[PDB]
Amino acid sequence: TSLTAEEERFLDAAEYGNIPVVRKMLEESKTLNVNCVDYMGQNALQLAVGNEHLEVTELLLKKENLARIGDALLLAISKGYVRIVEAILNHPGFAASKRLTLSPCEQELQDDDFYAYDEDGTRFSPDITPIILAAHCQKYEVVHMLLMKGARIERPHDYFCKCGDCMEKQRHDSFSHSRSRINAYKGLASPAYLSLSSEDPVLTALELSN
Amino acid sequence: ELAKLANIEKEFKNDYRKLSMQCKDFVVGVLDLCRDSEEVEAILNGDLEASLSRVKLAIKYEVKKFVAHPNCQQQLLTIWYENLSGLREQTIAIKCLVVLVVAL
Numbered sequence: 001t002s003l004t005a006e007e008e009r010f011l012d013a014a015e016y017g018n019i020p021v022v023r024k025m026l027e028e029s030k031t032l033n034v035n036c037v038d039y040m041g042q043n044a045l046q047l048a049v050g051n052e053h054l055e056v057t058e059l060l061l062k063k064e065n066l067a068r069i070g071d072a073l074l075l076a077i078s079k080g081y082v083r084i085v086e087a088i089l090n091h092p093g094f095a096a097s098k099r100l101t102l103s104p105c106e107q108e109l110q111d112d113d114f115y116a117y118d119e120d121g122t123r124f125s126p127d128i129t130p131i132i133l134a135a136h137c138q139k140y141e142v143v144h145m146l147l148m149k150g151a152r153i154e155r156p157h158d159y160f161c162k163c164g165d166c167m168e169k170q171r172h173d174s175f176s177h178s179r180s181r182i183n184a185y186k187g188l189a190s191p192a193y194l195s196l197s198s199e200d201p202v203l204t205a206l207e208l209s210n
Numbered sequence: 211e212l213a214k215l216a217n218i219e220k221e222f223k224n225d226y227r228k229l230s231m232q233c234k235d236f237v238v239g240v241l242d243l244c245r246d247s248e249e250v251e252a253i254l255n256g257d258l259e260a261s262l263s264r265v266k267l268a269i270k271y272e273v274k275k276f277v278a279h280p281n282c283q284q285q286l287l288t289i290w291y292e293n294l295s296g297l298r299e300q301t302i303a304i305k306c307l308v309v310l311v312v313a314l
Contacts, residue, residue: 125245159299175247175284 003036011038014060017053026059034063041118045072052081061091069094070104070115074123077134082141089149100151103127127180129153132187143192152197156184213271238275241282250281260289 003011006025010032013021025032034044048056049072060066069088076084089095099107104115105126117123124133131151134142157166169177187193189208194201212233216226244250255263265286268276276282291298297308 173247174288175250175281176245178284179245 003038006031007036007038010044011036011042011047014044014056015042015047015051017051017056019055019059022056023059026063034060034065035067043068043072045069046075049076049081049084052079052084054083054087057084057087061087064093067113068116070099071117071123073130074115074128074133077130077139077142078137080139082145085142085145089145095149100130100146100149103129125179125183127176127183132183135187135190135193138190138192140192140196143196147196153184153187153193155188156181234273234275237273238279241276241279244281250285254282254285 010022010025013025036042036044038047043066044060045057045066046068048060061069069091073085073088073094076088099114102108103126104110104122107115115122115126129151131143131146131153134146135153157163194205198204212226212230216223216230219226241253244253254265255261265277265282287298297304
């Protein structure tokens with residue numbers, strides 16, 4: 001119980017969806033950090049997206065510094081929400097980079113808490129990008145939004161390509177590499193991706209089955 | 211313990227055998243969730259501070275689905291070919307050439 005009383009009066013009003021009680025505390029602008037830890041270690045956006053509160057989510061993104069907009073994005077694609085995903089992709093700091101394309105582990109040196117959940121590890125496997133997670137859950141509206149933004153799954157290499165990048169990821173942790181290949185093919189082999197990604201889809205389905 | 215009480219009671223035979231399945235499925239459901247190689251090499255042998263101790267203890271108790279799971283089979287396969295490593299995916303003709311050369 002490290003949190004103060006303003007922290008609780010902020011967190012409970014966020015998790016219940018009180019638009020005036022949260023609007024007043026952001027408008028007060030006195031002695032408030034947008035980052036916080038409650039129970040397991042909930043955020044503002046993690047609490048506000050876990051139950052669908054769009055009016056709160058339009059307000060929390062008004063401030064500049066939120067450190068966990070990647071796990072709100074994965075939690076929103078994991079659920080059915082679409083307009084919340086449009087709000088998160090409408091954010092300017094998320095959009096003007098190669099954040100859609102990069103895996104959280106391969107995203108950078110990755111010391112930032114961008115894809116971080118709680119403290120121990122990322123919500124899902126560190127290889128899963130958002131367009132793969134959309135194709136696993138078969139959400140036809142989210143895949144179209146992410147394909148218009150410009151994210152396309154990259155085909156994994158051949159079993160023995162022997163390229164420098166493949167060997168370096170093979171000499172260290174063979175198991176996670178072999179798991180990431182199956183996650184990529186589970187992303188590619190789905191009716192969501194197959195129908196909306198390329199023209200002439202019946203031929204690429206017959207070819208990918210081979 | 212449950213699988214040995216099942217052979218001593220013999221009237222409550224089905225109940226202890228129903229409980230042993232829960233005791234095995236807990237271990238298999240824990241095994242599923244591991245992602246990195248450090249978690250697999252932390253489950254398959256215990257705290258060190260090879261030597262496959264939990265696998266050698268799951269042979270004695272006959273937990274078949276803990277050994278027949280793929281996350282254990284790949285760790286055993288990377289020991290079964292631990293210096294050859296190119297023979298891991300070859301035809302049966304190349305394997306028969308090997309046993310003929312060694313038998314000669």
